[PDB]
Design a binder for these strands. Structure first.
Ligand SMILES: [Mg+2]
Ligand SMILES: [Mg+2]
Ligand SMILES: [Mg+2]
Ligand SMILES: [Mg+2]
Ligand SMILES: [Mg+2]
Ligand SMILES: [Mg+2]
Ligand SMILES: [Mg+2]
Ligand SMILES: [Mg+2]
Ligand SMILES: [Mg+2]
Ligand SMILES: [Mg+2]
Ligand SMILES: [Mg+2]
Ligand SMILES: [Mg+2]
Ligand SMILES: [Mg+2]
Ligand SMILES: [Mg+2]
Ligand SMILES: [Mg+2]
Ligand SMILES: [Mg+2]
Ligand SMILES: [Mg+2]
Ligand SMILES: [Mg+2]
Ligand SMILES: [Mg+2]
Ligand SMILES: [Mg+2]
Ligand SMILES: [Mg+2]
Ligand SMILES: [Mg+2]
Ligand SMILES: [Mg+2]
Ligand SMILES: [Mg+2]
Ligand SMILES: [Mg+2]
Ligand SMILES: [Mg+2]
Ligand SMILES: [Mg+2]
Ligand SMILES: [Mg+2]
Ligand SMILES: [Mg+2]
Ligand SMILES: [Mg+2]
Ligand SMILES: [Mg+2]
Ligand SMILES: [Mg+2]
Ligand SMILES: [Mg+2]
Ligand SMILES: [Mg+2]
Ligand SMILES: [Mg+2]
Ligand SMILES: [Mg+2]
Ligand SMILES: [Mg+2]
Ligand SMILES: [Mg+2]
Ligand SMILES: [Zn+2]
Lengths: 125, 95, 155, 96, 206, 81, 60, 23
RNA sequence: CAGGCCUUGACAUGCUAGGGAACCCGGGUGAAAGCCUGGGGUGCCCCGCGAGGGGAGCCCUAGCACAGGUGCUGCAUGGCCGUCGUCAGCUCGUGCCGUGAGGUGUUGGGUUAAGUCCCGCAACGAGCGCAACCCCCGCCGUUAGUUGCCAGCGGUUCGGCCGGGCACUCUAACGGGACUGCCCGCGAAAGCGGGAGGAAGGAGGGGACGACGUCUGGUCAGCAUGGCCCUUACGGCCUGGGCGACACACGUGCUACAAUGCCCACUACAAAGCGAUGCCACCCGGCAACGGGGAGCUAAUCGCAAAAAGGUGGGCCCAGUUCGGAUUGGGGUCUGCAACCCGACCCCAUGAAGCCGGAAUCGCUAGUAAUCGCGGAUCAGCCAUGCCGCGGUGAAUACG
C-alpha cells in the first residue's frame, strides 16, 4: 500500500506517505493548494515527483510541523524524494545528481555576545 | 564642533578657550577638522593632553606629556601639526 | 578575495519559466527578504507584458536584458598625479549583474503608481531600446569609447 | 510512576537503570526509562569586575527528568526498592 | 589578563564538582549558603592540616562533608576526639545531620592547592621567591608529574615596583581538554602587601 | 494616576483638621510633597520642603487635586549664559 | 556608607517596597541573582571553582 | 506605524492590548 | 545635597562597675529617626516545703580595648577583565659561531587556516602557542516510552477523543560515520586540482578555548590587600531633595519620511524559555487599560500563547496624506506606604519635525546582511527603543 520518507529543513519535519493514486496531496488535513496558497516556492517540493517522470502515480498523505511554510516545503522535498527512492531504489540515479535527497544543513547561527544579530557588529569611532 | 574633556580635574572656561585657540593653529592647512576632541589629565609626573581628530584625508591622534600643562598642550599641537602636514603632502611622490 | 577565487553561486531556476535569469531578477526585485512579494511583481508584470503588446513575457524579459548588458565600461586607475577613467570589457557575469540592477533601478523611478506596472513597462521599452536602463548602458558605453586611448593602462 | 531528577545525567541514568531494572526481578512489567525534555537555566555574566560589557561567558544548569513506570507493582518490589544504591544526589519520585 | 580557569574549564571533563547534589528553585540559595559557611568554618580551623579539597553531599538533613587532607591528625586527633568536636560545630550551624570526614591525600606534593600554599607560606616567611619557586616545582617533578608550573606576582621580595615570577618544568598544556591539570591558589599577606601564588600540576591524559 | 483612595499622609491631615477647628492659624511646616491639597486646606500657608528649604504656599481653591510639592519646586534654574 | 549597608538589607524595614537583593559574599546590590543569592562576579568565581552544584560552562 | 499607539502594529511593538489590538 | 537625630555605635571578639535578663504591647512626642515612657515576667546546675539563693542563656547602662570609613594612592598590590589577536608566533636545553651584545635552531625551498606539514641544513631535541581531545547543528543505529499516532483496525460525542500500537514525529542518553581512506592528474615529498560514493568532504557550519608578552591599559566602588588619612565624625539612622537639571556639543540606538506602502476584517506555519503568597484557562462588567469571579499546573501531561512578516478581500490614490506619531489638553487603570519632582499602560482630542540627509562614516561573504515577531535575566512597578538568547522569510556581490 504505502511509501515513506522523512524530510527536514531548518527546524521542520515532514512525514510523507507516497500511497499510489490520482496525485491528490494532503498536508496537515487539506490539499497542497489550500495549505500553501500564494507562496510560489509551493510549486513545489512536489518537484521530486516530476523528477522520476511519474506525476500522477501516487497521492500523498502528509503531516508537517515545525518552522514555517517554506521550511516545511523543503522538508516535503526530501520527503517525497526519500519516499519515492524507497519505492524502487533504482531511483537514486537521476534523483541524487539532480540534488533532491541530501537535506541541506543550513540553519540559523547562534547570536553571539558583543555582536547584535550574530554577525552584525555595533558602530564605532 | 570642538569638545574638551578635563578628566579628574577642575578646568576653566578660560583655559578651555585657550586650548580652542592653540588647536586653531591647524586651521592653517585649510582642511576640515571633524569633531576634534581634546582630553586634559593630571598625572604624578605632569599633565597629559590627548587629541583625536578626523579629517577628509585621515585621522590625527597624539599625546602630549609635560610638567607645565601649557607646554603639554603645545607639545600636543606640535605632534598634531606634523601628522597633519603628512596627511596633506604624503602622496605627492607622484613623480 | 585575497586568497583564491570567490565562487559564483548557481541559483534555483524558477517555478513558472524554469529559468535561472528570472529568479536573479526576482532576487533583485526583492526587498527585506520578502520573496513572495518579489515574485508576484515579476509575474503580475508578465500578466501586463502579455495583456498589452501580446507576446511572450519570457521573450520580452530575456530581450530587454540583452538590450541592457554593457559591452564595455570604465574602471578608473591612479597613474602618477591623475585618476584615469579606463576602458575595459565587462564579464558576462558583471553584465548580467549590471543588466538586472539598472533594469529594476530605472523601473522604480518610473511614474507608474503600481510596482509591477513599473516593472512591466520598463522591460517593454528596453526590449525596444527605450528607457532609463538602456540609457545607462549606452551612457556607460560612450564613456568607454571616448577613453579608447587609455586602453593601454588596461589590466 | 517514579520520576527522576537531578543534574549529572551520568549519575541519574545509572540510577534510572538501577531502579527500573531492579523491579524487573521483584516485579513486572517495568516500562523503560523515558527521558523528559531537560530544563535549562542559562546565566550570562559579564566576564570582568568592571566595564567591558562585550566580554561574557555563558553558564548553564542542566536539570533533566526521567519517568519510569512499573506495570504490576508486586509489593516487596515496594521493599527491594524501599532502599537502593542512591547515588550522592538525585531526586526520586513515586506515586500510582 | 586572558586565561580561563583550568578547573572551571574542565568541570565535567577531567575534573568534577566539590559540592555534589540536586535542589531546584525554592531552596538552592540556602543549601548553597550553608556549604560556604561550612567551607569557611573548615578552611580557617582546618588550615594547618594541609588539605586541598572538600567534597560535599546532600540528601535531606544529611551533609556528608568529606575532607581530603595532608596530615589527617589535626582532624581525627587522639583516639578520634577533635574529629567529633568538629562533627559538633558543623551540626550546630548545619542544624541537621553532619558527618565529618577525613580522607588522606597521596604525595601532598602532587596536589596543587597544597604545593602553592607551601610556597605561599614560604614567601610570608621572607624567602628568596625565585628560588622558592624553582624548588616547589622541583619537588613536584621529582615525586613525578608529566610537568609542573608555578606563579608568584606582587612586590616580590618587597620591591616597590610590582613584578611577576614564573617557573615551570615538563608539560603544562592548558589548552587540552583532558589535561588532568590540578591547579590551586594561595595568598601571602606580607608586611608590605599581598602576593598571589598559582600552581599547576599535569597528572596526565584521560 | 491613583484610582480609589485619596492620599493625604494622615499626619498633616490631622494638623489641618485641628487648626481649622479651634481659631484657624497658619505656619504648618511639613516634609510631605506627596500630600494632595484637600479642600479642608483651602486657604492657609503651609511650609513645604523642596529639600534645602521650607517653601510657603498660600492655598487657594484654584488648586486642589494637585500635590503640595508641585508648588515648591526642587530646582533653582534662572538660565544658561 | 558600606558595611552598615549590608546589615541594613538584612532586617526587613517599614515597607516591603524597600526590599532589595544584596549578596551574601560581597555586599553588592548590583547584578545580584535571586537563584544563587549571588552577584555576577561572586557567581563566576564560585562556578569556576566547582562549588556551584551542577553548574557548567555553557557552550552551544 | 510601530510607534503609533492607536494601531495594531502599534500595540504589537508596545506589547499591549486595547481597542485597536484586542484580546 | 538640606535639615532632624545616635556613640560605643547598624556590625565583630573580649574584659569589667550597677541592673537585669529573654520577650510581646501601648503611650506621649516627632516628618521619620530619635527622645521621653505604663506593662507581664525567664526555664534552669540549683541549700529549696520558705524569704531567698548561686550560675548563665539574653537585654541595658557605664566604661573601655575598639568598631566603622564607596575616604586617598590601580604607578605600592592580589584577583578578574579589555587589547594587539585566533594574529603564528614566543622561547628553552645541550652543541656550534662571535672578544662581546648576540647569532644559530626559528632561516632557506615547497605547502598549509597555522613554527601546519614535507624536503634541505652545524645543528639535534624540547616546551608554551596551532591542531586534536569538550559542547551545538546536519545523516544513520541502539535503549526508551501517559509527548506522537486511522501509519493500523475498531469505536469516534468528532478533541488522537477511547480502545489499541511505538511504525512515525519527538524527546535524551549511549554509539556509528570523514580518513584526503578510493579513482584520475601533478609532485621529490608534504600536498593541490578534478571524480565517485555519501546526509555531510577537504577545518561539514557555529561554539568553548586565546602563547611569552604589550599598553606604568582597566578596577582600592564587587572582593581582597600594603601604606596615608578621619574617629559626637570623612562613622551611623532618618524625612526630603538630588543622581532625570538644559543655551549647547558628541556617541550608541528607536520610529520614520510611504504604494515592494498604510489601515481594517477573516485565516495560517516556529523556536527557545519561564511559571505557588507564580503562570491564569474560561465566564462576566468595562470601548479599553483593567476589575470581578473561577478551573488547571510542583508542570513534554495545565499556563504565559498571540507569534509576526506572510495568505485572503476590502479601503486608501500621491496628498505632508488613511504617510509619520512628536508635543500638549482632558478623562481613567495598575504597582506601590507614596507616582509633585519622576512609573508604565489605556481612551478621547491634539497630529510637530520629517519628501531619504554636508563634510564625513559603520556592518555584513549565506541561512549571512535586510526584514519579522517570541522568550529571559534583573524585577513591586518601570522609564527595555538596552542586553543575552530564539526561530520565521531570505538576497547581493568578491576582477583583483
Ligand atoms: Mg535570526
Ligand atoms: Mg552563541
Ligand atoms: Mg554594546
Ligand atoms: Mg567600544
Ligand atoms: Mg525594588
Ligand atoms: Mg498613522
Ligand atoms: Mg517596519
Ligand atoms: Mg501623634
Ligand atoms: Mg595597572
Ligand atoms: Mg591589576
Ligand atoms: Mg584611572
Ligand atoms: Mg665563546
Ligand atoms: Mg643565545
Ligand atoms: Mg622569530
Ligand atoms: Mg590560525
Ligand atoms: Mg608545532
Ligand atoms: Mg510507549
Ligand atoms: Mg524506537
Ligand atoms: Mg584550541
Ligand atoms: Mg595608569
Ligand atoms: Mg577595596
Ligand atoms: Mg609601618
Ligand atoms: Mg536617605
Ligand atoms: Mg545615571
Ligand atoms: Mg547632532
Ligand atoms: Mg535607543
Ligand atoms: Mg500537566
Ligand atoms: Mg501636518
Ligand atoms: Mg495623518
Ligand atoms: Mg503620548
Ligand atoms: Mg494630562
Ligand atoms: Mg514642514
Ligand atoms: Mg510624497
Ligand atoms: Mg540613506
Ligand atoms: Mg528606508
Ligand atoms: Mg569571514
Ligand atoms: Mg519585568
Ligand atoms: Mg524584549
Ligand atoms: Zn556577591
Amino acid at each position: 500500500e504505502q511509501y515513506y520518507g522523512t524530510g527536514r529543513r531548518k527546524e521542520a519535519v515532514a512525514r510523507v506517505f507516497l500511497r499510489p493514486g490520482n496525485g491528490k496531496v494532503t498536508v496537515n488535513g487539506q490539499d497542497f493548494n489550500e495549505y500553501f496558497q500564494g507562496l510560489v516556492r509551493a510549486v513545489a517540493a512536489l518537484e521530486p515527483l516530476r523528477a522520476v517522470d511519474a506525476l500522477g502515480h501516487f497521492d500523498a498523505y502528509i503531516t508537517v510541523r515545525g518552522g514555517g511554510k517554506s521550511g516545511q516545503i523543503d522538508a516535503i522535498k526530501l520527503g517525497i524524494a526519500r519516499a519515492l527512492v524507497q519505492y524502487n531504489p533504482d531511483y537514486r540515479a537521476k534523483l541524487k545528481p539532480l540534488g533532491f535527497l541530501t537535506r541541506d544543513a543550513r540553519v540559523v547561527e547562534r547570536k553571539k555576545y558583543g555582536k547584535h544579530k550574530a554577525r552584525r557588529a555595533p558602530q564605532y569611532s | 564642533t570642538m569638545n574638551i574633556t578635563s578628566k579628574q580635574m577642575e578646568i576653566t572656561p578660560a583655559i578651555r578657550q585657550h586650548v580652542a585657540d592653540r588647536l586653531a593653529k591647524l586651521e592653517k592647512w585649510q582642511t576640515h577638522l571633524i569633531n576634534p576632541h581634546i582630553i586634559l589629565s593630571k598625572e604624578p609626573q605632569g599633565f597629559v593632553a590627548d587629541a583625536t581628530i578626523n579629517t577628509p584625508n585621515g585621522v590625527l591622534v597624539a599625546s602630549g606629556k609635560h610638567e607645565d600643562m601649557y607646554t603639554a598642550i603645545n607639545e600636543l599641537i606640535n605632534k598634531l601639526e606634523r601628522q597633519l602636514n603628512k596627511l596633506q603632502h604624503k602622496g605627492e611622490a607622484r613623480r | 578575495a585575497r586568497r583564491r577565487r570567490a565562487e559564483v553561486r548557481q541559483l534555483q531556476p524558477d517555478l513558472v519559466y524554469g529559468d535561472v535569469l528570472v529568479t536573479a531578477f526576482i532576487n533583485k526585485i526583492m526587498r527585506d527578504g520578502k520573496k513572495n512579494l518579489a515574485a508576484r511583481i515579476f509575474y503580475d508584470a508578465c500578466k501586463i507584458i502579455q495583456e498589452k503588446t501580446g507576446q511572450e513575457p519570457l521573450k520580452v524579459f530575456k530581450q530587454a536584458v540583452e538590450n541592457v548588458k554593457p559591452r564595455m565600461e570604465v574602471r578608473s586607475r591612479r597613474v602618477g598625479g591623475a585618476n584615469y577613467q579606463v576602458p575595459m570589457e565587462v564579464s558576462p557575469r558583471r553584465q548580467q549583474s549590471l543588466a538586472l540592477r539598472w533594469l529594476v533601478q530605472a523601473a522604480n523611478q518610473r511614474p507608474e503608481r503600481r510596482a509591477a506596472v513599473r516593472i512591466a513597462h520598463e522591460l517593454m521599452d528596453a526590449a525596444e531600446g527605450k528607457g532609463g536602463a538602456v540609457k545607462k548602458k549606452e551612457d556607460v558605453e560612450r564613456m568607454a569609447e571616448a577613453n579608447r586611448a587609455y586602453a593601454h593602462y588596461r589590466w | 510512576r517514579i520520576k527522576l531528577r537531578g543534574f549529572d545525567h551520568k549519575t541519574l541514568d545509572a540510577s534510572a537503570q538501577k531502579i527500573v531494572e531492579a523491579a524487573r526481578r521483584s516485579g513486572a512489567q517495568v516500562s523503560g526509562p523515558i527521558p523528559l525534555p531537560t530544563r535549562v537555566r542559562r546565566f550570562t555574566v559579564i566576564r570582568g569586575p568592571f566595564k567591558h560589557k562585550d566580554s561574557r561567558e555563558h553558564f548553564e544548569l542542566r536539570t533533566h527528568n526521567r519517568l519510569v513506570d512499573i506495570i504490576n507493582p508486586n509489593r516487596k518490589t515496594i521493599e527491594q526498592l524501599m532502599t537502593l544504591d542512591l547515588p550522592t544526589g538525585v531526586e526520586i519520585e513515586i506515586k500510582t | 589578563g586572558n586565561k580561563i580557569h583550568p578547573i572551571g574549564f574542565r568541570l565535567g571533563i577531567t575534573r568534577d564538582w566539590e559540592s555534589r547534589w540536586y535542589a531546584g528553585k525554592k531552596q538552592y540559595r540556602h543549601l548553597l549558603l550553608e556549604d560556604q559557611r561550612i567551607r569557611g568554618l573548615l578552611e580557617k580551623e582546618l588550615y594547618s592540616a594541609g588539605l586541598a579539597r572538600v567534597d560535599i553531599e546532600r540528601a535531606a538533613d544529611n551533609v556528608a562533608v568529606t575532607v581530603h587532607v595532608a596530615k589527617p591528625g589535626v582532624v581525627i586527633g587522639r583516639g578520634g576526639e577533635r574529629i567529633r568536636v568538629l562533627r559538633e560545630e558543623l551540626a550546630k550551624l548545619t542544624g541537621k545531620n553532619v558527618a565529618l570526614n577525613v580522607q588522606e591525600v597521596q604525595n601532598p606534593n602532587l596536589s596543587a592547592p597544597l604545593v602553592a600554599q607551601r610556597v605561599a607560606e614560604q614567601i610570608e616567611r621572607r624567602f628568596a621567591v625565585r628560588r622558592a619557586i624553582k624548588q616547589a616545582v622541583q619537588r613536584v617533578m621529582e615525586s613525578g608529574a608529566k610537568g609542573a608550573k608555578v606563579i608568584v606576582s606582587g612586590r616580590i621580595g618587597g620591591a616597590e615596583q610590582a613584578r611577576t615570577e614564573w617557573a615551570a618544568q615538563g608539560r603544562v598544556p592548558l589548552h587540552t581538554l583532558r589535561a588532568n591539570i590540578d591547579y590551586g591558589f594561595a595568598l601571602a599577606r606580607t608586611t608590605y602587601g599581598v602576593l598571589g601564588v598559582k600552581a599547576y600540576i599535569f597528572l596526565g591524559e584521560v | 494616576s491613583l484610582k480609589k483612595g485619596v492620599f493625604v499622609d494622615d499626619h498633616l491631615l490631622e494638623k489641618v483638621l485641628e487648626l481649622n477647628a479651634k481659631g484657624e492659624k497658619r505656619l504648618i511646616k511639613t516634609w510631605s510633597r506627596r500630600s494632595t491639597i484637600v479642600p479642608e486646606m483651602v486657604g492657609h500657608t503651609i511650609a513645604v520642603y523642596n529639600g534645602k528649604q521650607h517653601v510657603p504656599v498660600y492655598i487657594t481653591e484654584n488648586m486642589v487635586g494637585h500635590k503640595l510639592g508641585e508648588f515648591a519646586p526642587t530646582r533653582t534654574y534662572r538660565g544658561h549664559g | 556608607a558600606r558595611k552598615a549597608l549590608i546589615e541594613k538589607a538584612k532586617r526587613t524595614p517599614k515597607f516591603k517596597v524597600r526590599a532589595y537583593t544584596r549578596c551574601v559574599r560581597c555586599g553588592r546590590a548590583r547584578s545580584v541573582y535571586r537563584f544563587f543569592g549571588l552577584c555576577r562576579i561572586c557567581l563566576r568565581e564560585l562556578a569556576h571553582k566547582g562549588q556551584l552544584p551542577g553548574v557548567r560552562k555553557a557552550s552551544w | 506605524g510601530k510607534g503609533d499607539r492607536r494601531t495594531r502594529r502599534g500595540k504589537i511593538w508596545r506589547g499591549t492590548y486595547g481597542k485597536y489590538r484586542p484580546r
